[PDB]
Design a protein around this ligand. Structure first.
Ligand SMILES: [Mg+2]
Ligand SMILES: [Mg+2]
Ligand SMILES: [Mg+2]
Lengths: 445, 445, 445, 94
């Protein structure tokens, strides 16, 4: 019931794994230490192995016994006969660092109990000592423990440990001298300038009123990517089903109208363009659609990670009308619901290192404003999706509100926020007959 | 030999000193509490004595035994002659202060070894626990003892004892004739006049809507307070990681835009200015960044107290987008959550004698107002971070909202609260292409 | 363990205390009775001493023995030697009325045992009795016992006693013909009219948004009633420490801006006024300041009772921003927490008969009104503070909101509640650089 | 639950006996009256024990406890004139 908590079987398993593989010792040398172990024979074995890996790389069965022999230690450290059992056991695979980490943790635990014993000792043993000379000692010891637990990554880093990563990214980008696109491209040249391409660890938002084009624009982004991104994409159509999506997308990629598709009065050239774009999409095999209705961020994360390990690793994610996302815990408070959603999506993007398009709606506030250009406040709910987002870009198409516009066939992509870049107003030509946005070779902005 | 020390003769001496004098109890009960004592009869007797000193001051010999009797407590706390014997004993003199001192001193030690036992045996019994979730428990309990004990200089001080420290501070300030900056220099001479620098035991707030400069500004402050000081600073980036922060700060220092960094398009005169600021930031080693996501106040405290005593003592703390900070006990009431956060940061600043920059957001209330110049009310939650603070200074770039304005490349710092100085409206200039606020040698304001 | 309850050390203690004290007899006579005792010899002694105190005034050792002889009763009540044991021991101090009261109620307890025995006797022995002649009988028994109730200091308080007290107070006021300020003075001659000074037992509340001047106003009240009254004032600065408060107060009294103080950049005419105000503050020794953070009301009580004991008796208390004050029992329900707080403060003021200033805050319910002139409903929590109070008086200086206002340097003190007096709108003048409110000679308000 | 309450043979001994017809309510009256006496013994014993060892308070609340039990059981019992009455009687009071 009561004992020093220690695991000693996985310990020997690590020992034999190091024996049968003289390559991966540095990675466990990061974690495991000679005094980390519990019993002294294992400690002798590991520290001898370490002294040898300084000098003698080959250490499996006999170099160990020889180095142990030259200084006269056989049968005082167990035995070569006993060592046979260690090399015999654990022919296991690269599942070694797990054992290493967990036993390293057990060592930390054992040390904690040791120091609690020391504190109890110094407590019941006064030695003519005061609370002020005692609690301060206790604080200093526990401080030395928690401060130094062989942990480097999670803690606040000195600047030289940050500039290494910064210069590393700069070398990753200079070592490939290429265009002014530091991530995913869209297919649109007027927008890649104000974005440097959809960057790879952000939460993009694509918001606009309902009849405006945001699902259309998003599908255009993803299909263009998947035509120039040899790497998967995802599409979560929580609103409409896959069979509307793909129809819209064939119309987009082939510049034929949607009625002609669904109803079936299309001409030989139309049939040909369809044939070609199909036979393209079926080769690259990027697009993966999920027409699930009421998802949660957990389901999103799982269904994205499933791809991201087996189909390689992914290039972007699209999410239609995230206000349908749910989390039943926060089912009463809608505001905190959306905040949890958005935080989880940003976390996902930082996890998988991809962008996360996340379509959203706007509120019926701009209608009584007479300009109609959507400002960042005009987001459907919670105000936090303008806070966790590293990019927002609204859509406004003046022909909807003004029949007397000189701005018809024209949609402008109001960048309404961008942390790592400028704001602006891109413009593009709308042709919803085949559900596409296209570039605008015309006046500047 | 190994026994819990409980100096018990002094206990009876205290009890009898109180029996023979109703007067000196509040003085004693500065230090004496029910849990302090070793044996339950003493506990019941003393809590009833205290209950009477609350209600009925006269208690010597039999008023206590009688309150005990008023509803049937006799012989569970010893006896009646047992009670009388304590009064008959100890006619000792006025050394009640020292007796109560030691009697108070020993019980906290007893609790200390109790906690040591609890931590150790809890280590033996993990109950679905990791070392990371265990050293946290240790830190939490030990310091919850220490803070609950350490504040034992408390009392209402006579005015002479106040003015001594007041005038000693004033002398230490006149001891060093210098400029009108009694604190950390911000680098912006237009701001230090209304502020006299980021004073050293206060919470500072920088708050603005999501694309306005608050992260940029609060990085300018530390960027300059690292150069001007020889003292460490800390940066808790709860929103986005270090590999973007530093790529924005290199530009903020060296005046080379962020695109020409990440892309690698930067010319020789720009490479040189990268190199200079590199060589500076490495030959000082002041800044310490933590890119952790959902920190609690306690983790902030620990990770600050670490850098405190290793590296001299800190000189500035920045906490990005406060509202992310968690405290899961108060996961439901977000309001009280923020109140706890703010109180904790304030107390931290009071502890380490440094400033604490604590950014925040603003609610979507100023938008439906037609002025857009934020006020002290539009803090994101709880409206306590307008109370626990000492310097609230918003940001307002008019050109973000009004397309057509003469306030372009101008950004003002709408001071909205001070407790020890004047409010105002400072005027600076923004150049986000290299992420910097600059002094505005321009017209009046 | 189980026995008929009766105490006898208190008995002989009281009897001997009366033997050694002819002066103080009536006070014990108001509580103890002949039948109040358990043993009959002491009943004889008590009733005989009482008969003599009616007839024969000196009764210590021999007058009572001689009387008991005149009734021919020696050796029936013990003996004169036994009485010498009574007169020898119990030289106890003035804690005698305590013994009287407790033994009084012990007679009541023994009566309770006897009466329950009577009820159980009627129970075992029904005597052929009806339930309607049983319950109401045995219940009117306890009722008839309740009829005794010699605690005649409660609800049945006829009007004449009230008017006696009231006329006594009116004689306290008219026997001293003075100005129309029956209370603490403030210094603000425009405020004492609407207030008649700060009444000694009422709970005053000062309330305004975070930078409207309430700490300042309150410090001016205390540091003016420190200069007028030769009576102490406390300050529970839970929010800021003494080393800022006192600086502020030096600036207030000496009218020099605080920036010239701490920076040390002040001139001879300023140093003189500093010398003068300090030489006043130390030649009066009148101010106490407690810089403790999370004070519960019990701590506040104790720390005020101390000064009300040592330094005569106190005349003002100030508690800064009471929403810091805790009571950890009610940490979950904040509303009940604050109600406890306010009730404790009112009780304190009624206990010491001294005015409690208790600074409060306001909710963000003004900002969405366009008036901003606060009302009682704009108090930060619980609504008890607007019920358990006797003088709320807000602070609204208008230039904080309306930049273009013709009231700069004007701070009006909206008396928003007062029981024993009017409401109104006092005006003052805000000069904040030296942290003072001053009077205003101006038009009709 | 057979025989946990005596037994069905005893139950038949109950059914066999007592051929009384005229008076049951009066027997019930005296039984309830004795039960009221019994509960009065219970309450008095509670008072005596909670005078001997009632475990901790000021006896100001003990006097109130006596009065409380008294007037409570007074209100719990006393109303036995209670019953639905006739309009030819209610209208008399009205
Ligand atoms: Mg859609
Ligand atoms: Mg930011
Ligand atoms: Mg204040």
């Amino acid at each position: 019931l009561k004992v020093p908590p220690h695991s000693i079987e996985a310990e020997q398993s690590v020992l034999g794994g190091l024996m049968l593989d003289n390559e991966r010792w540095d990675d466990v040398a990061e974690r495991v230490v000679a005094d980390d172990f519990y019993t002294r024979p294992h400690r002798h074995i590991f520290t001898e192995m370490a002294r040898l890996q300084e000098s003698g790389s080959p250490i499996d069965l006999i170099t160990l016994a020889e180095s142990l022999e030259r200084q006269g230690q056989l049968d005082s450290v167990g035995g070569f006969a006993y060592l046979a059992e260690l090399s015999k056991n654990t022919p296991s695979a690269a599942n070694i660092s797990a054992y290493a980490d967990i036993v390293r943790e057990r060592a930390v635990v054992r040390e904690m109990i040791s120091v609690a014993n020391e504190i109890a000792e110094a407590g019941f043993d006064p030695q003519g000592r005061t609370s002020e000379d005692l609690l301060d000692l206790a604080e200093s010891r526990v401080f030395k423990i928690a401060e130094s637990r062989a942990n480097k990554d999670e803690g606040p880093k000195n600047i030289a440990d940050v500039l290494d990563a910064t210069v590393a990214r700069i070398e990753q980008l200079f070592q490939q001298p290429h265009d002014g696109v530091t991530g995913v491209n869209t297919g649109y040249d007027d927008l890649n300038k104000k974005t440097a391409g959809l960057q790879p660890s952000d939460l993009i938002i694509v918001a606009a009123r309902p009849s405006m084009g945001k699902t259309t624009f998003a599908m255009n982004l993803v299909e263009n990517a998947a035509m120039l991104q040899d790497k998967p994409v995802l599409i979560f159509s929580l609103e409409m089903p896959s069979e509307q999506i793909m129809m819209r997308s064939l119309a987009s990629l082939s510049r034929v109208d949607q009625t002609k598709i669904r109803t079936g009065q299309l001409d030989d050239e139309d049939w040909a363009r369809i044939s070609g774009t199909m036979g393209i999409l079926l080769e690259k095999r990027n697009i993966y659609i999920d027409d699930s209705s009421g998802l949660t961020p957990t389901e999103v994360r799982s269904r994205a990670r499933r791809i991201a390990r087996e189909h390689g690793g992914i290039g972007l994610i699209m999410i239609d009308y995230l206000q349908l996302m749910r989390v039943p815990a926060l089912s009463d408070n809608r505001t905190l619901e959306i905040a949890e959603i958005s935080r989880s999506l940003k976390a996902l993007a930082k996890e998988l290192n991809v962008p996360v398009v996340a379509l959203s709606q706007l509120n019926r506030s701009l209608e009584q404003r007479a300009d109609k250009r959507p400002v960042n406040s005009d987001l459907r709910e919670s105000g936090s999706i303008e806070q966790d987002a590293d990019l927002i870009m609204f859509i406004y198409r003046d022909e909807v509100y003004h029949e007397n516009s000189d701005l018809k066939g024209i949609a402008e992509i109001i960048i309404g926020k961008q942390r790592n870049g400028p704001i602006g107003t891109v413009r593009l030509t709308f042709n919803g007959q085949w559900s596409r946005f296209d570039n605008y070779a015309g006046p500047q902005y």
